[PDB]
Design a protein around this ligand. Structure first.
Ligand code: HEM
Ligand code: HEM
Ligand SMILES: N=C(Nc1cccc(CCNCc2cccc(NC(=N)c3cccs3)c2)c1)c1cccs1
Ligand SMILES: N=C(Nc1cccc(CCNCc2cccc(NC(=N)c3cccs3)c2)c1)c1cccs1
Ligand SMILES: C[C@H](O)[C@H](O)[C@H]1CNc2nc(N)[nH]c(=O)c2N1
Ligand SMILES: C[C@H](O)[C@H](O)[C@H]1CNc2nc(N)[nH]c(=O)c2N1
Ligand SMILES: [Zn+2]
Lengths: 407, 411
C-alpha cells in the first residue's frame, strides 16, 4: 500500500503513495505479469465527473469551497438533464496536461506543464478540422523550434457522431507493396496507404511520400486533404564523418504528432485529439530506420561501412546501428530542428520522477517503454525500478476507425 | 483460460495454457504492475501437497502417472514426511527437479539448453572442506579447458533452518573489491562488502584490480571457512580487440566460468540452499554490465578517450560507440582463446526458437521481458518484439537473503 522503488545505480529510494489513487486495471494479476503485452450512462458519468472536479479544485487549492460544490451541482444538473456535460476551458487545459502527466509510457513528461491546448470543440466539418490541424502543425513546428501542443475536437456523444483523424500520425510516409514482392516506402502504413488510394489519393509512389490527412467530422465519411508542403518540415539525413551517408537518400519529418488516441477527461471522451512534441533520436534511428518491418536499412548501411557481415559476433548490426543514430541527431541539430538524444531524455525523466515523487507522491512509469531501444543499461532508466499504474485523465488506444465506421 | 502472445515483427501468435499450473504469486495486482521490481522450516501440513504435486509432475514426464510405482512412491513419501517430518529425493527426481528449475527460470535467456545439465549430488557432504572438494570438481568439470559444460552441485537440503549449507560468495569465481580511503574503488565495486568479510575472516588480500576471491563455505549451519580455488582451475581471458592494438594496454581480463552460488533451489517443498550452477556467458554480461555500469569497472570514459571520440556532448553518442567496441573486444577474446561465449544476437534468436517449441510441447514458456532483453541493442534482437507472460512454476530458483545478515555465529 506504501511502495518503495529503488535506483540500483545510485541507491536512491522513493516511496509511492500515488498508486492508491489508481482507478483502472492493469492486465496483471497475482498469478501473471502482463507488463510486456502491447495492448492489454448517466450512472457511469457522474462518479467520473466528480472524481475529476475534486482533483481540479484541489489543484487550485479550492477543495470544499462554494465554487467547487457549485460546479459539482451545475455539472450534476447538466448530466441528469442532457445525459452529458461540457468542460470549462480551465478544466480542459488541466485535463489535457494531466493526461500527459499520467502517460506512464512517456519518457518526456518533464515537459508536461508546458502544453499549448487548442480548443476546437466548435468544429463541425472535415474542412474545419483541416484548418485547425494546419494551425496546429504551423504553431508546433515553429520553423524548427518545436513546441508541445494538442488540439481537441468535439467529444463523443451518441457514438455515431464521432470525430476521428484516420491517420496514426498527422505526418507519415506512404507504404506500397510491389509485384517485385517487397515494400516501397514505410511498410507500417501499407494498409492506410491503400485506404487513401482507394479513397481518391493520387500516390506519387516514392519512398518518402507524405500521406494526405483523412478526416472524419460528426460520423461522416472521411475526406482527403494534402497538408501544405510548406508546413511539413523535413530533414535530409547526413553523417558528420561518412560522406557517402547522404547518398543513402534518407530523410525524416521533424514533427511527431500522434493522432489516433482517445483522450478521457472526467468521464468524457475526446476521440480526436492530435498531440505533438518532438522526437527522441532513437525513435527514428533505431525504430523507424532499422526495425526489420520498417525501413530496415541496417543491411545496406553496414555494406557502405565495409564491416564483417559473415558472423553475428562481429556486432556489425550494432556498429551500424550506432552510426545511423549519430547521423539522425547530427542532421536535426545541423538543421536546427528540436530533437533529444536518449541519454539526455532519460536523465531528464529521472529528474522528473524525483520531482513527482516529492510533489505528487509518485510517478506511474512503464519500464518496458521508458528504456530506449538501444544502449538500455548505460542510460539511468535501466537501473530504475518503476511502478506502472493507470490514472485519469488519460490517453488510451482505440480501434482503427475503418474497422468501426459505416459508410 | 487461454492467453495469446504476439510477436510484433513476425505476427506469430502463440497460446498459453501452462500459466494455469502456476501457483506462486507475481508481486503484481489488477491495479499495479511490479514487472520491473528487482526482488520478488515448513510444517508437515504445507509439505505433502508440495510433495504430491511435484511427484505427479515427475511421474507424468516419465509416462508412469497412475502406475503402481507412482502410487507406492506417494505413500512412501507420505509416511516419511509424517514420521521424519521431511523426506529425501531419489537421484532421478533430483535430476529432473534441477532441470525443471532451470526450465522454469523466466529471467534466463539460456534455457534452450535446459535438458543438458550435469547434476552433481553432494547430498552426502558434511563439512566445508567437503564442500570445497565438491566445488573444485564442479569448477574443473564445467570449465573443460574452455569448452564449457553446464552443471549444478546440490548440497544437503534445509532441515530445521539452523543447519544450513551455504556458499557465501555470490558466484564461485569473482574479483575482490577494495574501497580506498580517498573514496575510490580498486577491483570490482560490486564485491566490496563480501571482500571485507573475507579480509576479516583471515584472507590475505593481494589488493589488485583482478584478484580472485576465496571461497567462503558454511556446512551444516557452522561458521564459514575460507578456501582458495587452485588458480590452475580458474580459466581467465585477457581482453583485446581485433583492430584496436591499444585495447590490451587497458589491462582487462575476465574469468570464463559464470557460476551462481547464492540461489535457493526449491523442489517438491524441499529447500536446497547451497546449489551452485554454472553455464557460460552472454557477451553483454561482461562487456556492457561488468565493464560499463557506473557501479562496476566503469571503463567507458577511458575507452572513449583512447578512441578520440567527441566527448563534450552525449549527442555525439560517444558512450554508445565505446560500448560497442568493448563488446566486440569481449567476444573476440573468448572466441580466440576457445572459451565458450555467446553473443546477444545469437542468444536471443535461440531463445525465440526455444520459446516457440515450448508453447508447442508444453503449452507455454514463462518469460521475463525486462530481463530477457539484452542491455544493449534491444530492438535489433527479436525478443524486444516478443510479448511474454511471466509467472512462477516450481520447481524453481529463488533469491535468499545474504547469509551474513542471518547467520548465528558460534565463535
Ligand atoms: C516533448 C517532446 C516529447 C518527447 C521527446 C516524448 C517522448 C516519447 C517517446 C519516445 C514515447 C514512446 C514512443 C514510441 O516508442 O512509440 C512516448 C510515448 C507517449 N507519449 Fe511522449 N514525448 C514528448 C511529448 C508528448 C506530449 C506533448 C504528449 C501528450 C500531450 C505525449 C504523450 C505520450 C503518450 C500517450 C505515449 C504512449 C503512446 C502509447 O502508449 O502508444 N508525449 N513519448
Ligand atoms: C548455458 C549458458 C547460459 C547462458 C548464456 C545463460 C544466460 C543467462 C543470462 C544472460 C541471465 C541474466 C543474468 C543477469 O543479468 O544477471 C540469466 C539468468 C538466469 N539463469 Fe541462465 N544462462 C545460462 C545457463 C543457466 C543454467 C545452467 C541455469 C541453472 C541451471 C541458469 C538459471 C538462471 C536463473 C535462475 C537466472 C535468473 C537470475 C536472477 O534472477 O538473478 N542459467 N541466464
Ligand atoms: N506495429 C508495430 N508497432 C506499433 C504498433 C502499435 C503501436 C505502436 C506505438 C507507436 N506510437 C506512436 C507514438 C506515440 C507517442 C509518442 C511518439 N513519439 C513522439 N516523440 C511523440 C509524438 C507526439 C508527441 S511526442 C510516437 C507501435 C511494429 C512495426 C515494426 C515492428 S513492430
Ligand atoms: N546488486 C546488483 N544487481 C543485482 C542484484 C540482484 C541480482 C542480480 C542478478 C545477477 N545475476 C548473476 C547471474 C545470474 C544468473 C545467470 C548469470 N549469467 C550466466 N551466464 C550464468 C551463471 C550461471 C549459469 S549461467 C548471471 C543483480 C547491482 C550492483 C550495481 C548495480 S545493481
Ligand atoms: C512486445 C513489446 O512489449 C514491444 O516490443 C514494445 C517494447 N517496448 C517498446 N517501447 C517503446 N518506447 N515503444 C515500443 O513500441 C515498444 N514496443
Ligand atoms: C530496475 C530493473 O528491473 C533492473 O535494473 C533490471 C533490469 N533488467 C535486467 N536484466 C538482466 N538480464 N539483468 C539485470 O540485472 C537487470 N536489471
Ligand atoms: Zn505486471
Amino acid at each position: 500500500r506504501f511502495l518503495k522503488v529503488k535506483n540500483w545505480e545510485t541507491d536512491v529510494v522513493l516511496t509511492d503513495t500515488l498508486h492508491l489513487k489508481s482507478t483502472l486495471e492493469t492486465g496483471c494479476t497475482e498469478h501473471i505479469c502482463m507488463g510486456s503485452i502491447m495492448l492489454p450512462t448517466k450512472d457511469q458519468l457522474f462518479p467520473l465527473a466528480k472524481e475529476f472536479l475534486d482533483q481540479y479544485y484541489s489543484s487550485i487549492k479550492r477543495f470544499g469551497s462554494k465554487a467547487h460544490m457549485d460546479r459539482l451541482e451545475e455539472v450534476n444538473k447538466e448530466i441528469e438533464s442532457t445525459s452529458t456535460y461540457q468542460l470549462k476551458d480551465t478544466e480542459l487545459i488541466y485535463g489535457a496536461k494531466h493526461a500527459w502527466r499520467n502517460a506512464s509510457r512517456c519518457v518526456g513528461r518533464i515537459q508536461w506543464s508546458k502544453l499549448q491546448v487548442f480548443d476546437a470543440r466548435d468544429c463541425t466539418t472535415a474542412h474545419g478540422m483541416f484548418n485547425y490541424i494546419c494551425n496546429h502543425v504551423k504553431y508546433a513546428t515553429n520553423k524548427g523550434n518545436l513546441r508541445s501542443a494538442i488540439t481537441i475536437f468535439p467529444q463523443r456523444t451518441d457514438g455515431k457522431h464521432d470525430f476521428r483523424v484516420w491517420n496514426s500520425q498527422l505526418i507519415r510516409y506512404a507504404g506500397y507493396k510491389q509485384p517485385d514482392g517487397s515494400t516501397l516506402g514505410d511498410p507500417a502504413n501499407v494498409q492506410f496507404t491503400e485506404i487513401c488510394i482507394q479513397q481518391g489519393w493520387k500516390a506519387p509512389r516514392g519512398r518518402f511520400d507524405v500521406l494526405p490527412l483523412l478526416l472524419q467530422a460528426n460520423g461522416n465519411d472521411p475526406e482527403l486533404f494534402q497538408i501544405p508542403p510548406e508546413l511539413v518540415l523535413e530533414v535530409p539525413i547526413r553523417h558528420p564523418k561518412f560522406d557517402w551517408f547522404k547518398d543513402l537518400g534518407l530523410k525524416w519529418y521533424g514533427l511527431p504528432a500522434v493522432s489516433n488516441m482517445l483522450l478521457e477527461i472526467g468521464g468524457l471522451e475526446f476521440s480526436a485529439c492530435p498531440f505533438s512534441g518532438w522526437y527522441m533520436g532513437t525513435e527514428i534511428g533505431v525504430r523507424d530506420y532499422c526495425d526489420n518491418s520498417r525501413y530496415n536499412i541496417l543491411e545496406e548501411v553496414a555494406k557502405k561501412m565495409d564491416l564483417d557481415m559473415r558472423k553475428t559476433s562481429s556486432l556489425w548490426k550494432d556498429q551500424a546501428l550506432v552510426e545511423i543514430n549519430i547521423a539522425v541527431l547530427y542532421s536535426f541539430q545541423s538543421d536546427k530542428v528540436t530533437i533529444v538524444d536518449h541519454h539526455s531524455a532519460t536523465e531528464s525523466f529521472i529528474k522528473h520522477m524525483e520531482n513527482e515523487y516529492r510533489c505528487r507522491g509518485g510517478c506511474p512509469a512503464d519500464w518496458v517503454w521508458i528504456v530506449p531501444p538501444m544502449s538500455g543499461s548505460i542510460t539511468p532508466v535501466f537501473h530504475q525500478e518503476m511502478l506502472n499504474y493507470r490514472l485519469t485523465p488519460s490517453f488510451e488506444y482505440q480501434p482503427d476507425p475503418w474497422n468501426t465506421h459505416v459508410w
